[PDB]
């Protein structure tokens, strides 16, 4: 009310309203799902268009051969944060000849987002990110929120109606976690998960967006006729 003019101001109950308003931009964004087994880690994302004449806004971004994310909210902020991740992964490779741990990737994003919430003039990031990756400790899935909070999970979803897919994955936990050495089945589980967030619209060939990374699989993205297999 009187305490939402900028990010530097606390409310009387101890809330940061600008950070909460940035969180609201994620809820308006299109749904995206993330899940993983022990061998692989999968991202599924529902893309969104302006109208029938427009293209579908790309949700998934590669960060390295072994890491990438999906987005929900302000796309330009995702481009800034992804580009920062691309540099950090690249710094680790050039200087230490070392693939950047997915956990460190989260710690770095957390600290970058935080600085924007404690200084005058700046604003919080208005996007949420799901980061998947395979490193020296196996598969990983992370959830980033622009408050700074990063969380490691087996599965999750963010965006509009993300609660449906999040409930499904909470039921299916025991099943999909043991889908080892089988990419197509882990995707099928992720596609069925995102389907629990659909209303009036179904998954079409230029609507769906899948990305996978794992033991003997680099981070790759599937679109167009390559996802027709999963409808």
């Amino acid at each position: 009310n009187n305490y939402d003019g900028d990010t530097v101001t606390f409310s009387p109950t101890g809330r940061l309203f600008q950070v909460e308003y940035a969180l609201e931009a994620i809820k308006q964004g299109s749904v995206t799902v993330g899940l993983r087994s022990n061998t692989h880690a999968v991202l599924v994302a529902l893309k969104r268009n302006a109208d029938e004449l427009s293209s579908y806004q790309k949700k998934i971004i590669k960060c390295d051969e072994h890491m990438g994310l999906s987005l929900a909210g302000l796309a330009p902020d995702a481009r800034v944060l992804s580009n920062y991740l691309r540099q950090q992964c690249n710094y680790s490779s050039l200087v230490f000849n070392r693939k950047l741990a997915v956990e460190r990737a989260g710690h770095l994003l957390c600290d970058k987002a935080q600085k924007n919430t404690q200084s005058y003039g700046g604003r919080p990031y208005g996007v949420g990110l799901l980061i998947i990756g395979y490193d020296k400790s196996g598969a990983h899935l992370l959830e980033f929120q622009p408050s700074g909070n990063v969380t490691e999970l087996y599965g999750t979803a963010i965006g509009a109606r993300s609660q449906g897919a999040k409930t499904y994955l909470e039921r299916t936990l025991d099943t999909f976690i043991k889908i080892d050495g089988n990419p197509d089945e882990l995707i099928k589980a992720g596609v069925e998960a995102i389907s629990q967030s659909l209303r009036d619209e179904s998954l079409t060939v230029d609507n769906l967006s899948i990305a996978i990374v794992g033991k003997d699989t680099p981070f790759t993205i599937y679109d167009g006729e390559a996802v027709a297999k999963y409808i």
Binding site: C110, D111, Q114, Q118, S147
Partner: peptide, 11 residues
């Protein structure tokens, strides 16, 4: 409290 603020302080 705010976990990110705690991380900034540790850094």
């Amino acid at each position: 409290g705010l976990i990110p603020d705690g991380r900034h302080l540790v850094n």
